[PDB]
DNA sequence: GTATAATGTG
């Protein structure tokens, strides 16, 4: 998840886009790193199965 | 050999994370399905680990 | 029933028949899951009558 | 929480666009692109027209930004339908935004068709491609993913029609897919089990605990490997010095690389036929007596 | 938009903390703790530690 | 950001940066802008102008 | 690579 978010951020920066989508994806990467370091410490924990 | 006078902990900085690492992870692919072996610059690449 | 109502709200109303409407997979799946993994379905110990 | 809600407010900040507004924005963006092409093509750069061109380029950038901001709603309304398929809704929304940008960079207004129709196909294609390329941890090739989806669709159709799970033969007959290929596609399409799920249901250990290794055991190779290496130093050393070098080169004790009779003959000058007799004599010598007794244990 | 520079995200916090100087605020908070104001004194003591 | 700091109780980033927890969480997840730095010296010298 | 149309969630 973290790698995909980071690569998407790099792609968006390379192509360029209005700051709304870039900011949304930056929030996405931040939340993904947050989930990586700890699940449930903040917000809804992630669950696949 | 086994002389450990003290054990300390600190806050890692961008440079410390890079110094510990031998290589940078660029892509999220984990394993190649056909060869059952790690992929280039993935989460298991021999080049990295 | 959730899936049945969702399907019927979208499928054509002219040539609709209950046979094509009812889906039997979820009910049998639930029954099998209960009989397999439920904590109240235990092996019948057979040391003696 | 509710990462979606902040994005919903952000997207809802901007208003929609009408057919006339869409046409005027398309004209403005075309003018801006043509202005940029002139900037990179105006070898005889004008003085005031250059400033006007820069202003027009900024205007076109603002116009395209506004167009995308207004169109994000269609992206959301399309990505809504692909939730619950191994990818968070928000990831699908971002993929759809990328698809919308891809559609905008190739939009044409002369045909008179509405931008929404053109953008919907691109958004759907981008979303499905991203889901195929990122949903599975063991990322299968896109063609195999398509085959798996086809097989699943056929299986559900047969289950609905017949009222029961179709057999492998029936599935192959309907889909015309080989039974072996059907099995391969069904085995490659499966959710992996996370080694951290508890086993036994008492949480006394997670599954990852009970998994053995596949390397040299404490005894299996270590003791036998070292012992047969020492017994090698004892037995293979008994071979004559010339024969010891013969083994070391043709068979590869010291320098490895078993030197074919031609190679070892080049090294020593001997022919391919002479060495065979000495090799067979060595075989006869080794197979009799304490040597064979020692080496029996390592052949079984 | 010529004097104040503002932004939203972790990058903004990084820039602000880098610009922020620990010694100056530490001295100011030591001076504040030198005073009373018990209601604010507990928060001042936590921030000071 | 590291999750342990801006979310822990006490939030170390909040204490060091003299920000309320609500403000910190709003800034981190891209909720509202913040003034990082301002040319206060030029503002002062140009207070008349 | 696409041309009716398709514009804010669980």
Swiss-Prot record, chain B:
Q: Under what conditions is it induced?
A: 6-fold repressed by starvation.
Source organism, top-level taxon: Bacteria
Q: How does it assemble?
A: The RNAP catalytic core consists of 2 alpha, 1 beta, 1 beta' and 1 omega subunit. When a sigma factor is associated with the core the holoenzyme is formed, which can initiate transcription.
Sequence similarity: Belongs to the RNA polymerase beta' chain family.
Quote the function comment for this protein.
DNA-dependent RNA polymerase catalyzes the transcription of DNA into RNA using the four ribonucleoside triphosphates as substrates.
Full protein name? DNA-directed RNA polymerase subunit beta'
Q: Which organism is it from?
A: Mycobacterium tuberculosis (strain ATCC 25618 / H37Rv)
Phylogenetic classification of the source organism = Bacteria, Bacillati, Actinomycetota, Actinomycetes, Mycobacteriales
Q: Which residues of the full protein are shown?
A: 4 to 52 of 1316
Curated annotation (Swiss-Prot), chain C:
Q: What is the effect of changing residue 27 to A?
A: In strain: vr1; rifampicin-resistant
Instruction: Indicate the impact reported for residue 40 to P.
Output: In strain: vr2; rifampicin-resistant
UniProt function note: DNA-dependent RNA polymerase catalyzes the transcription of DNA into RNA using the four ribonucleoside triphosphates as substrates.
Q: Which family does it belong to?
A: Belongs to the RNA polymerase beta chain family.
- How does this chain assemble? The RNAP catalytic core consists of 2 alpha, 1 beta, 1 beta' and 1 omega subunit. When a sigma factor is associated with the core the holoenzyme is formed, which can initiate transcription. Interacts with CarD, TRCF (Mfd) and RbpA.
Name of the molecule in the record: DNA-directed RNA polymerase subunit beta
Species of the source:
Mycobacterium tuberculosis (strain ATCC 25618 / H37Rv)
Q: According to the entry, what is the taxonomic lineage of the organism?
A: Bacteria, Bacillati, Actinomycetota, Actinomycetes, Mycobacteriales
Swiss-Prot record, chain D:
Q: PANTHER family from the xrefs?
A: RNA POLYMERASE SIGMA FACTOR RPO, RNA POLYMERASE SIGMA FACTOR RPOD
Tell me where the sequence motif Polymerase core binding sits in this chain. 91-94
Q: What happens when the gene is disrupted?
A: More sensitive to SDS (cell envelope stress) and hypoxic treatment in vitro. No effect in human THP-1 macrophage-like cells, intravenously inoculated BALB/c mice or aerosol-infected Hartley strain guinea pigs.
GO BP, one annotated term: response to hypoxia
Provide this UniProt record's keywords sorted from A to Z.
Answer: DNA-binding, Sigma factor, Stress response, Transcription, Transcription regulation
Protein name (record): RNA polymerase sigma factor SigB
Its induction note reads:
Expressed in exponential phase, peaks at 10 days and decreases after up to 50 days in culture; induced by detergent (11-fold), heat shock (23-fold, 45 degrees Celsius), low aeration (2.5-fold) and oxidative stress (2.7-fold, SigE and SigH responsive). Seen to be induced and slightly repressed by 10 mM H(2)O(2). 2- to 6-fold induced by starvation. Its basal expression is largely under control of SigE, probably via MrpAB, although other factors including SigH also play a role. Half-life of about 2 minutes.
Q: Which gene encodes it?
A: sigB
The membrane spanning regions, by residue number, are: none
Q: Tell me the segments the record calls region Sigma-70 factor domain-3.
A: 146-222
Q: Which family is this protein grouped under?
A: Belongs to the sigma-70 factor family.
Pfam families hit by this protein: Sigma70_r1_2, Sigma70_r2, Sigma70_r3, Sigma70_r4
* Subunit description: Monomer. Interacts transiently with the RNA polymerase catalytic core formed by RpoA, RpoB, RpoC and RpoZ (2 alpha, 1 beta, 1 beta' and 1 omega subunit) to form the RNA polymerase holoenzyme that can initiate transcription. Interacts with RbpA, probably 1:1.
Which ranges of the sequence are coiled-coil?
none
Give the source lineage, highest ranks first. Answer: Bacteria, Bacillati, Actinomycetota, Actinomycetes, Mycobacteriales
What are its GO cellular component terms? cytosol; plasma membrane
Q: Which segments carry the region annotation Sigma-70 factor domain-4?
A: 235-288
Going by the entry's taxonomy, the superkingdom of the source organism is recorded as Bacteria
User: What organism is the protein native to?
Assistant: Mycobacterium tuberculosis (strain ATCC 25618 / H37Rv)
Q: Does the keyword Zinc-finger apply?
A: no
- Enumerate the residue ranges of region (Sigma-70 factor domain-2): 67-137
Q: Where is this region: Sufficient to interact with RbpA?
A: 1-205
The terms under GO molecular function for this entry are: DNA binding; RNA polymerase core enzyme binding; sigma factor activity
Annotated region (Sigma-70 factor domain-1) at 2-36
Which sections of the sequence are annotated for DNA binding? 261-280
């Amino acid at each position: 998840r973290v790698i995909n978010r980071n690569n998407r951020l790099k792609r968006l920066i390379d192509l360029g886009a209005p700051e709304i989508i870039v900011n949304n994806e930056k929030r996405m990467l931040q939340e993904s790193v947050d989930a990586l370091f700890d699940n449930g410490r903040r917000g809804r924990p992630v669950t696949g199965p | 050999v086994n002389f450990f006078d003290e054990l300390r902990i600190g806050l890692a900085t961008a440079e410390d994370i890079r110094q510990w690492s031998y290589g940078e992870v660029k892509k999220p692919e984990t394993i190649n399905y056909r060869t059952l072996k790690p992929e280039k610059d993935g989460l298991f690449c021999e080049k990295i680990f | 029933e959730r899936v049945v109502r969702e399907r019927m709200t979208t499928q054509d109303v002219e040539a609709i028949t209950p046979q094509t409407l009812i889906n039997i997979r979820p009910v049998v799946a639930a029954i099998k899951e209960f009989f397999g993994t439920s904590q109240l379905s235990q092996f019948m110990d057979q040391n003696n009558p | 929480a509710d990462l979606v809600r902040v994005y919903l407010n952000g997207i809802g900040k901007t208003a929609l666009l009408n057919a006339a507004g869409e046409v005027e924005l398309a004209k403005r963006i075309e003018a801006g692109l043509y202005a940029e092409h002139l900037l990179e093509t105006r070898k005889r750069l004008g003085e005031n027209r250059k400033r006007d061109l820069a202003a027009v380029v900024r205007d076109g950038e603002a116009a395209r930004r506004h167009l995308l901001e207004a169109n994000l709603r269609l992206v959301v309304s399309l990505a809504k339908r692909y939730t619950g398929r191994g990818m968070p809704l928000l990831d699908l929304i971002q993929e759809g935004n990328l698809g919308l940008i891809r559609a905008m960079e190739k939009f044409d207004y002369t045909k008179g068709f509405k931008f929404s129709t053109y953008a919907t196909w691109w958004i759907r294609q981008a979303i499905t491609r991203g889901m195929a390329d990122q949903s599975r941890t063991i990322r299968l090739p896109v063609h195999l993913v398509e085959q798996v989806n086809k097989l699943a669709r056929i299986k559900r159709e047969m289950h609905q029609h017949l009222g029961r799970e179709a057999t492998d033969e029936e599935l192959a007959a309907e889909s015309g897919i080989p039974i072996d290929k059907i099995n391969d596609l069904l085995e490659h399409s499966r959710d992996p089990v996370s080694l951290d799920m508890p086993v036994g249901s008492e949480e006394e250990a997670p599954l990852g605990d009970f998994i053995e290794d596949a390397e040299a055991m404490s005894a299996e190779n270590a003791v036998i490997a070292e012992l047969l290496h020492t017994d090698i130093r004892s037995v293979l050393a008994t071979l004559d010095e010339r024969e010891h070098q013969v083994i070391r080169l043709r068979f590869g004790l010291d320098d490895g690389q078993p030197r074919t009779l031609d190679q070892i003959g080049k090294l020593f000058g001997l022919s391919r036929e002479r060495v065979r007799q000495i090799e067979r004599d060595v075989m006869s010598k080794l197979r009799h007596g304490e040597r064979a007794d020692r080496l029996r244990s390592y052949a079984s | 938009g010529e004097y104040f520079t503002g932004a939203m995200g972790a990058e903004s916090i990084q820039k602000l903390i880098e610009n922020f100087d620990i010694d100056a605020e530490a001295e100011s908070l030591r001076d504040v703790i030198r005073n009373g104001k018990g209601q604010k004194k507990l928060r001042a003591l936590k921030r000071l530690k | 950001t590291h999750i342990w700091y801006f979310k822990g109780v006490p939030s170390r980033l909040g204490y060091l940066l003299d920000l309320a927890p609500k403000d910190l969480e709003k800034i981190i997840y891209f909720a509202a802008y913040v003034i990082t730095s301002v040319d206060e010296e030029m503002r002062h010298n140009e207070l008349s102008t």
